[PDB]
Write a protein that binds this ligand. Sequence first.
Ligand code: NI
Ligand code: NI
Ligand code: NI
Ligand code: NI
Ligand SMILES: [O-]
Ligand SMILES: [O-]
Lengths: 570, 570, 100, 100, 100, 122
Amino acid sequence: MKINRQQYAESYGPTVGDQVRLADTDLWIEVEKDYTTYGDEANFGGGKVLREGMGENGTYTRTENVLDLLLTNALILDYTGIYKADIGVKDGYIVGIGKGGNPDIMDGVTPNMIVGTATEVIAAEGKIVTAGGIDTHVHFINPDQVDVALANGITTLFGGGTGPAEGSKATTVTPGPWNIEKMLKSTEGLPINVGILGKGHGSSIAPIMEQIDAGAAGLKIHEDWGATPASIDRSLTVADEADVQVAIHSDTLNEAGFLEDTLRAINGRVIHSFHVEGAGGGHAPDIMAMAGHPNVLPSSTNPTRPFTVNTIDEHLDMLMVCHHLKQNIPEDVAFADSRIRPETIAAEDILHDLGIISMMSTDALAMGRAGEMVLRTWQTADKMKKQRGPLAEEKNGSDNFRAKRYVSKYTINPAIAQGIAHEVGSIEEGKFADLVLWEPKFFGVKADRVIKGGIIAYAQIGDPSASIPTPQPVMGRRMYGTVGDLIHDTNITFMSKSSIQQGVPAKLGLKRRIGTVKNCRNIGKKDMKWNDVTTDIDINPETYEVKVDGEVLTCEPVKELPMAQRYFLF
Amino acid sequence: MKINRQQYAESYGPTVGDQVRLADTDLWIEVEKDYTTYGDEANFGGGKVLREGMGENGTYTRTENVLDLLLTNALILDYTGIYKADIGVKDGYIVGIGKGGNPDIMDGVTPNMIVGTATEVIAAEGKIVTAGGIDTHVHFINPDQVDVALANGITTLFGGGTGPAEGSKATTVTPGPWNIEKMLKSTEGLPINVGILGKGHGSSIAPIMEQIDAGAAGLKIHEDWGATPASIDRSLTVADEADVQVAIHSDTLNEAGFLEDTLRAINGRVIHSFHVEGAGGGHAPDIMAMAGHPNVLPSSTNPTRPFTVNTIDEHLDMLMVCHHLKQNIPEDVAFADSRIRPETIAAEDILHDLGIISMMSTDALAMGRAGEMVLRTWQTADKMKKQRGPLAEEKNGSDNFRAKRYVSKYTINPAIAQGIAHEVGSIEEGKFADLVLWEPKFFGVKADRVIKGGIIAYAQIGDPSASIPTPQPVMGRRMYGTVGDLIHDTNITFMSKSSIQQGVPAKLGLKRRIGTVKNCRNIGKKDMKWNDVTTDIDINPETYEVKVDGEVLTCEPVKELPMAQRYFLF
Amino acid sequence: MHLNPAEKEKLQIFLASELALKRKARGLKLNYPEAVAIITSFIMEGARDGKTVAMLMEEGKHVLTRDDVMEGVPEMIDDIQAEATFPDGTKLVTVHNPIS
Amino acid sequence: MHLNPAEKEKLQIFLASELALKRKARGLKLNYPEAVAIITSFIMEGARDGKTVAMLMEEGKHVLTRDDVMEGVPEMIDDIQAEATFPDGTKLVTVHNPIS
Amino acid sequence: MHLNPAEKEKLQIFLASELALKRKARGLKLNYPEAVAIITSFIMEGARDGKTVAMLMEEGKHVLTRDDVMEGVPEMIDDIQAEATFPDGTKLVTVHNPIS
Amino acid sequence: NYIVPGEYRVAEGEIEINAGREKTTIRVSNTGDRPIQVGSHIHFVEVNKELLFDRAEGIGRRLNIPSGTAARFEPGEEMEVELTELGGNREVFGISDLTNGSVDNKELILQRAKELGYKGVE
Ligand code: NI
Ligand code: NI
Ligand code: NI
Ligand code: NI
Ligand SMILES: [O-]
Ligand SMILES: [O-]
């Protein structure tokens, strides 16, 4: 007996060779391989396969190769591939990707993916499943920002702040031991993974290092605290000892040096260059040249992504009003004009497409949108396909190469940069079960269900008073993973090795899972998945023209984007 | 001096012989007896009786027969009677039902109901007070469902789920040790009493039993996991060892057997038969015959309650769309037609009235409404009075017999079935102070105040910024019993004896009151208060006609209900 | 008023529907949430009017047509569900393929 | 806008009142929460207009009559209370037996 | 509908704007939150209409004038900011000194 | 180029289920008065007693239908179904407790089926 492919895909999700459109973009992903055995697909419900003695094993105890949770028939989109598989979770971790069921009666069952008495089921047929997004440029300003992030599929926030204090409104910084301790305690109530950055500023080591020992997961160098040669140097000396990452927002004003002076202070050491295009901050006008260097892990923030007809007007005005700049003071106008540049914003689109900028991030509530990292990644990829064509490496008419390049920018690459990719950032065996289910029609726009540590934390779901969960109004809501003490087991506080060795969690009474930051100092650009290109980037000081390999990088702004007015009520 | 009865009732609530209409129904309850001493009624306020040296004793310390809380002048509606009394609470428990005040100067004071320095007062004059509702068919799908339940006077949720996972969306199951542990932790943040059901599926004992040892309070057998003879048998063997209840949703499809096969697997052992009418699930078409057997504790779920002109159209469509059934596939239509039956739904109304179905429940968010168990119980009683007349056992023109039969279905009977009636389910001395105050005009529709463990947890109350609490908008709101650590002392997590003996609460860090499930295996239908009828129920396989004692049970659907459009904004 | 949680939530649907109807009145093709809101509010107001579940299943298919909404919106909406208080209590309405 | 908690809440009353007024305009007898919402919103809009507490106590008794509401609703509503910002600050209005 | 947190919040702005417009229609000079709500809702509806950020920066200065608002309100409002979904995605509009 | 958000473009061809396994066609009768629906993955010998068929031919087998579908038998209905072979270890536990082990133990399965009144054992 044979099933036609349309029917097959409707019942079990797509299989090898089938393509799926991402939202209302022009981007198509193709199933590369499928772990199933045709006829023994897992599924759950009345008269379905996962029943006792059938696709559910009735013999084995939980310890004996049985899962806590099976996601059936997932279309995985990950740096590691675009493919169809069942996903098995146990003890809050991904333990198996393959084929789940009952070896009693089914062929091809992955040996540790038994569905048993202990196993919960999530149907992922017809869904796209990705890793949770890893946002590494978060300002902790307003706690309402967490749900905003979850609703667009973000599961880890790295950054800093103490709420709407001016220091935090400008910089991703939680300064000093006491503010760090306070925010680690606050974190116990935030239903998302968190790592906190200390202030990467000082001329003596001890004031900086004591932040790491207090529980910071990294540092931020920001011009508003003095992004001087000394602060850069001491922060990187600290980071090299402590095995944490340093992020930089360089000296826009070129007050103590130009870009080459910042690079000399860095002295070949690893650093994460935030908003590398520079509208979000950095040496005017040439900061984006950072993205060509082998020791730089370069990210974009999201409001320049991608380049649209309203971008420049929006950013020039935003910069002026937020810095209290006056339209009639020529120095203020000159500064704004040196910082907000169509030439570098246009080139940033193309640098993403070429794999020269490795990461996305938000800059939430400081100059970026907490809930639009994933959204704008895919709008960028879509614009690049329309303007540049399929990448040369594509085949079968699919956009798989571009899709793996772009999904990397907000999943695995930030995780690698931060020293946390042993725990999060991809759908791989042995990593924490932070998973996002997407209906393809809403892909990258609104997440269906966000799984944190193997339990649903956030879902688009309807009327709680109804006979069933789908009646209106369907909206984003916190689920049981966020409630009571379960918030502790479903989320990770990432901390320095030294703070963990010194017993900071016990001292503060932290009950969350504790994640160790490590392996951040002997990586480089070459470690960025699908985005590993080093090159000489030239930015013309007179025209702001960007050249790579002797060629000017320019593109036009677009008047319309997908993943926009079809979806949003405002 | 004498007071006319109208005036008396306005000031102190009704007394012996007085009747009260339940909401906008035709049902009248009559005060059977009154514990007061006329002239020494307790009341609180300016120049009122509960003042120091007067109705408040100024001598005794809390330990010396003094209450923590007195509910004055309550009209109790309970399986034990419909009567007027003061209710005294201490250490979160009901310690006295009688007459509160000061033995210094008042006659007839119940000796442990002294109002002293330590005593809070709730005025219940003109209110009806019931036990909190006990819902034993809860799917834990969306945490917003808790307030929905509280707003309609429910105080205990028994069921299962991990949030909006497909397993949980279909079945009241929290599967395996790990999911159970996670949901026990989640429960620490839910302001309601909870007990969790494990998966009642397996062919070996150990995979099932380990759920009980992990902290489950019972099991659910559901056809979607394979309601086979083996799963039934092993679950009941477990239950008989562990002293917990088993709920069943039987094999609708009759795949491995017909009803008689399920009963043979049960083999005379105690079981709770969910949605026994069968629209909610079970052997087609005759599952409702379960309700005649002495070892079956039968409940209804709420969307069939009671039978109305929109019921069938609503249920047929709901079943089709939720099971992805197609209107043009004859097997799908045949299945729907075999499951949604006016003949059995009509008969279910009458079986409730006759005391043959003992319990109500919701089936919250799976095929039932979290906030309508109490509501629909009284709509059913009202419809039955209109169609069948006063029951023969009534007198004085009151509906007291029917009211005690119906209040039992969602208070004491579920509690008995689950093995928790030592703690909850009725207004009796020695039980936990879960109490619901109702304005008669809103009785069974919207609770005024819900007391949990002797502290108000939920209330219909107004503008928090106002000079007084009654200005608009008056809406359901969580009160101080839900806040901070008080949520631990005002609510009970019900758990198996074995999990408690093995120290599961300490292992997981549970701070809630821990309740023991017990005495579930040597009860039967005869133990269901006011609803203890056993009989041979015949369901005609060709016509779906229901007969009891040789008589067809049929009634008409109604076009309108009370407790509906007069009350609700949507 | 004694609003319960659902009553509070469902005010939002009415509000979104009003917003959407304003947008339609000034000539905009409606988007996905706008369309859902209009049809949902229509169902709940119909229940309040005392229509049957069967009437609303029919009518809900003729509230908006293709030419009222953006490209792709008809195919995004497979069905719209709402619960409301009919004269005979709460019932569920499902409108299948509301926009052809 | 700098909305405080009460301002946020009281937007709901206006919204419910608008909903209720729509229902009344298409010929429905109003229910208990509808009636309360209409009268409450009337009070708060009157305060905003600069009426006195005494004026609103009088007027609030003539906003809806028996024949505007369902059987029993008049006797369900003993009084309606609202606080609003008058020209001389927040004051409480109680309208006693608003529907005779 | 799949409302996200911002969509839920921003319904409130529309609602406050409707309330304010009612008050203006019966002849009241508007207060500080009323004025902010009207101008904010105008911006978000303009984005939905497909106007540019530059158009809305201009237009937002002519939605209300001095004689529409109470004494001091013009000088209380230095600028009004809103984010909305334009045809090219979310953008920020700032209207400087909206009421001269 | 009308855009249906999230649409599929499936490849050409058909998916053959249970490829390479032996198939068997048998006649089955619902001798009962209530409908019986049988899922794709129940060990066929262990279905409802009142289904009459050659029980031996259900041992080690299940319905050759798409995973998650079912065959329906109205009261009194007789029809042919196609079976495929169980895979994996070819063991069955639980269900109706007829096997609890290898499906190769045909004599023991049938003896249990007969003692318990499963129709169609010689
Ligand atoms: Ni910056
Ligand atoms: Ni920043
Ligand atoms: Ni069920
Ligand atoms: Ni259920
Ligand atoms: O930034
Ligand atoms: O159910």
